[PDB]
Subunit: 116 residues, 4 copies
């Protein structure tokens, strides 16, 4: 269920593969190789059967062969296989700063992913 192509609410494209031992691997993009970055993470490979969703998280560092923004985003959330399968997340984006600007280093937000 988690394996596939997912889209967030602003239209970015996340191609994710879920491995048997809890690994998440894939890529995050915009439609150019210049805008493609590697993602990696983990998920709960044996969730509960009570109806709960499946907890997961992943990271993207915003460095590829073409560009480097000196930043990384982590998404923390859960997959729900409902009428529409979705992944609901909260994220944190941290930019490299000097320690004097460290208090403003980190943004927070939320993203919903769908296969549509």
């Amino acid at each position: 269920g988690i394996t596939g192509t997912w889209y967030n609410q602003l239209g970015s494209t996340f191609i994710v593969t879920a491995g048997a031992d809890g690994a998440l691997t894939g890529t995050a993009e915009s439609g150019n190789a210049e805008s493609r970055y590697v993602l990696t993470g983990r998920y709960d490979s044996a969730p509960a059967t009570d109806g709960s969703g499946t907890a997961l998280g992943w990271t993207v560092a915003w460095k590829n062969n073409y560009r480097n923004a000196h930043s990384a985003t982590t998404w923390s959330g859960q997959y729900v296989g409902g009428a529409e399968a979705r992944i609901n997340t909260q994220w944190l984006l941290t930019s490299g700063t000097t320690e004097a600007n460290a208090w403003k280093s980190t943004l927070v937000g939320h993203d919903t992913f769908t296969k549509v």
Copy 2:
């Protein structure tokens, strides 16, 4: 720089390998050991900025499973008292109507001790 053993505020031990390709792999040890994986900026600036990174632990191994995952977002700061400063989000699997309460937030500081 990043590769090695790191200790957080509450005596947990993280052993991390920083790959040349930007990969972070390792373990988090608090039966208590779990895989971590993540990414870091493998070509950071040299203007005194720290190096941006993130990683994820899903809290399942061969013995236990808390149906949760934690992601840490932060940066490595090199030097005399090297540290990794982070913020984290812990998400637990909930049902639909408990989802408002699925996510904790906090912060952690890692040192080489």
Copy 3:
């Protein structure tokens, strides 16, 4: 545009008054309107926002104690007001519970709420 009754995705009802000197005061209550479910809110907002189409920054707090009950916690909402025909307040919130020192690492929840006029 902020003064009025706002409803979040949970159905809860927030009655907010925005005063001329950036004060926000009001109540949070259940759909059902009973006294037991009513709590005080206080916060602040940008009383002279940009004219560029930007929204209006604001925040407020609710401690979940009233004369009837006490959950020993507080929620803060940080967000901005977007006006128009589909005025909304977009927020992220932190909820903190009183905890012993041992449990402080798990004292604070985070999430997001969107408020509408309808």
Copy 4:
């Protein structure tokens, strides 16, 4: 106990008064960002905290507008007061700036502040 002058790790000064009704009122002077002079602070606290050694839940907001400057943003602090020899308030915060819609995704910063009654 909560009433007093508090300082965070960055030297900012917060002068808070806890009312018997659960109200928090006061002033903030920040050492960082787009600011100068004092700004109004308002919030709420649990005026009847548990008795089991748990902290006192609280929160407040500052909108960063005064007669001198306006940064079009507001910060909320959420946390708890821990009484004692060295009393302290441990918080997490959210800072939201007014943006347009297309920029809304990068509108909110998140952090943590620790306050003491003794200035660093």
